[PDB]
Amino acid sequence: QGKEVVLLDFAAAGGELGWLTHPYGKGWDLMQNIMNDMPIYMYSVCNVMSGDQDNWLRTNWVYRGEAERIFIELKFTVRDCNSFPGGASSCKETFNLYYAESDLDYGTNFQKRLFTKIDTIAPDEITVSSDFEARHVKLNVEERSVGPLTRKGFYLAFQDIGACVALLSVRVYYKKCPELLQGLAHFPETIAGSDAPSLATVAGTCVDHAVVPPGGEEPRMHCAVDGEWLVPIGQCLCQAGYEDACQACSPGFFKFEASESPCLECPEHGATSCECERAPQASMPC
């Protein structure tokens, strides 16, 4: 992979980050447990025996910036409906992941009708009754992704339909191919595209005192969706008199043309060549 640019990170906010819940108050709730001797927070809902549940947890408005494809990393726990010894009829073991784009933050004015369903998130590890006494945390990881994003920003939403969920992390990020120095050329930081096969062709600019040889391919790189720089084409070589950077040859050493080869010694009489102030044809033993 390449470089990730983090737009949202719930677990990094230290509880200080507050997400709207709809209907107001009811539904999801912020919890404060201790994990690995560290204070942690989480959003929980467990209205398994009530019915007609439609509990929305909406993250705050996220400035998209230059991001084309966002990556959504969720860390949550889900409890089995048979773990309730009482019996939950209106019970579910899933929640739906939504998103919405907007150029304005609506703050408290939340409208479900504006949210598009990303997926039905299901636990890979379901919390059974024996897990509580065993103090075993079954922490589920689900990565989803949305692209292309175009508006000024977005919201992520977690709509619950009557399940027992505990959401410990929500980390949204986009990828970039980093500022590279390769083949004596500079390639700028490039935003990774949205479409999975796509490769953006990035032109290179030769480093200080380096040149693209005549005939030789111009330095170019390809930026991948994951932020990787793939398939190098062309390169730069140190110009006449120069030999990871291009530095002038040491005295009594020279370089006639731009090439991979270093600066050779001066037999027998800077620098592009060594003067004799005889030879008919300026890199030959004069």
Partner: protein
């Protein structure tokens, strides 16, 4: 609804070593840590422990696996550090606790840097 608990030696409710709060299901207990804006050493800081009656009576914890929250931010910019416990019948998180009806739950303190003059503790009873 919610029950405010200012966990500090200056609270007279702790002085008879029998501070007891009565709650109903789905209610919150807001334990408010000490907060200042005073000498940096004199600032009370505690380790809150959710424990059993034995640990309550003796006022001593049996293991670190009882530590509930830390009152380690006494001069916190935002405001007082709190611990908001929902007295919920069911939890989706295993390391957390489920609160049954007709039961008693106990909270105990330990000064982080200061000396233990008196025992600071609270009993929460579910109706």
């Amino acid at each position: 609804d919610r029950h405010t608990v200012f966990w500090n030696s200056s609270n007279p409710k702790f002085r008879n070593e029998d501070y007891t709060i009565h709650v109903q299901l789905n209610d919150y207990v807001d334990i408010i840590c000490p907060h200042y804006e005073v000498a940096d050493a004199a600032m009370e800081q505690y380790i809150l422990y959710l424990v059993e009656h034995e640990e309550y009576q003796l006022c001593q914890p049996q293991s670190k696996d009882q530590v509930r929250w830390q009152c380690n931010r006494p001069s916190a910019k935002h405001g007082p550090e709190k611990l908001s416990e929902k007295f919920q019948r069911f939890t989706p998180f295993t390391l957390g606790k489920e609160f049954k009806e007709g039961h008693s739950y106990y909270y105990i303190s330990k000064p982080i840097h200061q000396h233990e003059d008196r025992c600071l503790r609270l009993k929460v009873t579910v109706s």
